[PDB]
Design a binder for this molecule. Structure first.
Ligand SMILES: Nc1nc2c(ncn2[C@@H]2O[C@H](COP(=O)(O)OP(=O)(O)NP(=O)(O)O)[C@@H](O)[C@H]2O)c(=O)[nH]1
Ligand SMILES: [Ca+2]
Ligand SMILES: [Mg+2]
Length: 161
């Protein structure tokens, strides 16, 4: 079937794994479990199309190998962590440099929106997303708000590329 090679990137601890686990294993669980590299392959149906999501959940912390192979990128920061938002520029730049492309399927993800103590305003990330020509979607791995939204939108960006 059609396969979509999705890569989740972003600073350490923003909730990359948590987003992926919530998508594939329909659950969250608050716990500390740093990622080295993990692969989830799930047959889904998105907009009537049966497809295989091949998601690489990467380390925040050798990224050229996994980036090169990537079709679409979830670029994640956390709304309670200004550094991870500031770190967004570098991941996009590194993805452009390895993908030799101004325009790779990509979504900007503001995760942990369940949390009361916001330090990155939505307008702020919205303005940044617009300047990249990519969608901005806020998520909560905890409550699952926006999770399918983030990933399915990325799949849709890949289809429209
Ligand atoms: N409140 C809240 N906590 C979250 C959310 N997503 C992740 N967390 C918490 O934030 C911590 C880090 O999550 P994790 O998914 O491991 O982050 P990561 O970016 O994958 N880290 P790594 O780069 O090391 O793999 C954990 O305590 C996790 O439960 C979220 O949406 N809301
Ligand atoms: Ca290059
Ligand atoms: Mg992880």
């Amino acid at each position: 079937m059609t396969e979509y090679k999705l890569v989740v990137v972003g600073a350490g601890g923003v909730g990359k794994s948590a987003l992926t686990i919530q998508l594939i294993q329909n659950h969250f669980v608050d716990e500390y479990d740093p990622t080295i590299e993990d692969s989830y392959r799930k047959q889904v149906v998105i907009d009537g199309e049966t497809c295989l999501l091949d998601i690489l959940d990467t380390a925040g912390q050798m990224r050229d190998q996994y980036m090169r192979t990537g079709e679409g990128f979830l670029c994640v920061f956390a709304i309670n962590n200004t550094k991870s938002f500031e770190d967004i520029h570098q991941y996009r730049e590194q993805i452009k440099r390895v993908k030799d492309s101004d325009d790779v399927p990509m979504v900007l993800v503001g995760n942990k929106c369940d949390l009361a103590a916001r330090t990155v305003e939505s307008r702020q990330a919205q303005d940044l997303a617009r300047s990249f020509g990519i969608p901005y979607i806020e998520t909560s791995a905890k409550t699952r708000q926006g999770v399918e939204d983030a990933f399915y939108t990325l799949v849709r960006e890949i289809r429209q590329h």
